[PDB]
Amino acid sequence: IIGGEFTTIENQPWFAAIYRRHRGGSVTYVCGGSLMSPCWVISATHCFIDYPKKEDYIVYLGRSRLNSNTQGEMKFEVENLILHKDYSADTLAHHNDIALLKIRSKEGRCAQPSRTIQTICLPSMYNDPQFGTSCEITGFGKEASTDYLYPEQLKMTVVKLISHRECQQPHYYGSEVTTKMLCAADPQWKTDSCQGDSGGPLVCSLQGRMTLTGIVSWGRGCALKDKPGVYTRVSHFLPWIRSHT
Amino acid sequence: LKFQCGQKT
Numbered sequence A: 001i002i003g004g005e006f007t008t009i010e011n012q013p014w015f016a017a018i019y020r021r022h023r024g025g026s027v028t029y030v031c032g033g034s035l036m037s038p039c040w041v042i043s044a045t046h047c048f049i050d051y052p053k054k055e056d057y058i059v060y061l062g063r064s065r066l067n068s069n070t071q072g073e074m075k076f077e078v079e080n081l082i083l084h085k086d087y088s089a090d091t092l093a094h095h096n097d098i099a100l101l102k103i104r105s106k107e108g109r110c111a112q113p114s115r116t117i118q119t120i121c122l123p124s125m126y127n128d129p130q131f132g133t134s135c136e137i138t139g140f141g142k143e144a145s146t147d148y149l150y151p152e153q154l155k156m157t158v159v160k161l162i163s164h165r166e167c168q169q170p171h172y173y174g175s176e177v178t179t180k181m182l183c184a185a186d187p188q189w190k191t192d193s194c195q196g197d198s199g200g201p202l203v204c205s206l207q208g209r210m211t212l213t214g215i216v217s218w219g220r221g222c223a224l225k226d227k228p229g230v231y232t233r234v235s236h237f238l239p240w241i242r243s244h245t
Numbered sequence B: 001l002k003f004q005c006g007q008k009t
């Protein structure tokens, strides 16, 4: 996240950290995700696309740091890894970029509620906040586009939703952004999501609930002028989600 | 005990 504050998981108790094992001994961070229900985490298909071997990914809930433990965290294996059929990538956009991970712990249970583990709410069929709403994104991604390491402490920031009209202006992204995508930027292009933030949540409030409005998907550069971050529009995938949960 | 989506505190 460029800009932002450092936070602890108590402020995003539904945030999930997905790592990949290299039996060589190391585990690396892959992307972020969100807990929908006790056993399901949602993230972005492009995070798994190149190496869809579920057996090698680990998911942690209640983690405030990237490579050090947090007390209260839970670790799970991925029981099911559902990527979206019709996912596509072009010179910038990722289409149908949402993924579901069914988790199971070594004891055979799913997430349990605590002060560091909570689920986030889903929106209702094609129900979104209006552009202008300020939402928050969270994650362990880069702090500057030139960095080559990720922060060790979780970060969070606030970004505002912009309209498609604004985001599809030719000097922004043109028709690369569809109606199954959402754009969010900072008025002063000072904070944004970035490499390593893929899969995490864009939470806005809808009807009185903190709702998972978008999934960090792509962006040209990070905190660049006229280059909003693009998120998958969860409200447009509700049936897809239902058909698998 | 049980989840309440969206509730932090």
Ligand SMILES: NC(=[NH2+])c1ccc2[nH]c(-c3ccccc3O)nc2c1
Binding pocket: A192, A193, A194, A195, A196, A197, A198, A216, A217, A218, A219, A220, A221, A222, A223, A228, A229, A230
């Ligand atoms: N600028 C952005 N809003 C943004 C967000 C998520 C990203 N994720 C990535 C990314 C880059 C290479 C491989 C995987 C990724 O998720 N770039 C990203 C850029």
